[PDB]
Every structure is written in C-alpha cells, then in structure tokens.
Amino acid sequence: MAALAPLPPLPAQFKSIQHHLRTAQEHDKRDPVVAYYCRLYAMQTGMKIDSKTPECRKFLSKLMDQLEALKKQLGDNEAITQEIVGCAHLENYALKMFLYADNEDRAGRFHKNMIKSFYTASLLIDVITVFGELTDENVKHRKYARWKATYIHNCLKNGETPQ
C-alpha cells in the first residue's frame, strides 16, 4: 500500500550506493523498516560524497523526503522510535541470509544466489555500523562473507568446485 514518488535520474556519483537504495526500494514491498534504515545509510554516504550540489540537491531532497514519508507512514513504530529494537531486527535479518547460504553449501550445491546472499548480508552490516558500534560477530561475518563470496566466485571462475 505504501509507496514513494519516483526518483530523478541517478548520476554515476551515487552509483556506489545505487545497490543500497535499490534494495531499499525492493524491501519497501517486503518490509518498510529495512528500507528506512537502508535509506539512512545511503544518505550518510551520499552527503559525504557530495554535500549539497545544485544538481544532486534534487536527489538529496527527494531521498530525504522518502525517509520522512516512511516515518509518518508508520507513525508509532518501535523499530523507528526504538533504535535498539531496529538494530536487533537488522541483525536477525543478516543471520537468516547467513544461514541460508551455509545451508546451500552443506547441500553440496552452489548458485549465484549464494554470492548475492553474502553480498546482501555485508550491506546490512554497514547499515548497522551506522550506529557507530560494531559487534565481534558482525566484523567477523563481514570478513567471512567477503572471503566466502570471493572464494566461491573465484573458484567458479577458475572452473574449480568450491569446498
């Protein structure tokens, strides 16, 4: 039911965060909480790359409103009001994807989904780093996912069956 007005053309400047906002737009249909936090991360990295540019200004204004819209859309939400609750929710999401990938490995089958799953998990980790605090598992998971993601990708590229 919830929806946000269309966003202007995306310049190469925000290409690095394109994957972030892109996933957010997708989640908007799955979960608004994830999108809200996701958009927050994009904004931070956005302003850092380009504070306020007469051109990007349009993108920033729209993006900023998008987050504001979600806030009012829900209104009284623990995930929004309580950061701790939202933090635990995000962590759980990463765990679900993390296990899913491991489950596929045990099955003795590898697919492009595994790499995508690991990549998605890493993205969530960043969204969590925004809190300025990182857990031991969060940091370890990032490295583990980075290695597994690359290792699996490299193995396939070399035509070798992953371990």
Q: Which domains does the chain have, with CATH numbers?
A: 1-163 (1.25.40.270)
d(CA 115, CA 85): 28
For this PDB entry, the determination method is: NMR
Closest CA to 36 of 92, 91, 86: 86
Neighbours of 132 (CB within 10 A): 5
> Any idea which residue has 């780093």 for tokens?
129
Q: Which two tokens stand for residue 58?
A: 């349009």
Closest CA to 32 of 5, 1, 61: 1
d(CA 88, CA 91): 5
First to last CA, the chain: 44
Q: What is the dihedral of CA 34, 38, 39, 42, to 10 degrees?
A: 180
- Please name the residues in contact with 99: beta carbons below 8 A apart, sequence gap of 6 or more: none
d(CA 79, CA 96): 18
Q: Label residue 75 left, alpha or beta by phi (over 0 means left) and psi (-120 to 50 means alpha).
A: left
Q: What angle, 0 to 180 degrees and rounded to 10, lies between the N-to-C axes of helices 112-129 and 136-157?
A: 150
Asked if residues 63 and 18 have their Cβ atoms less than 8 Å apart, the reply is no
CA atoms within 13 A on the CB side of 14: 27
d(CA 3, CA 49): 27
DSSP, collapsed to helix, strand or coil, labels residue 159 as coil
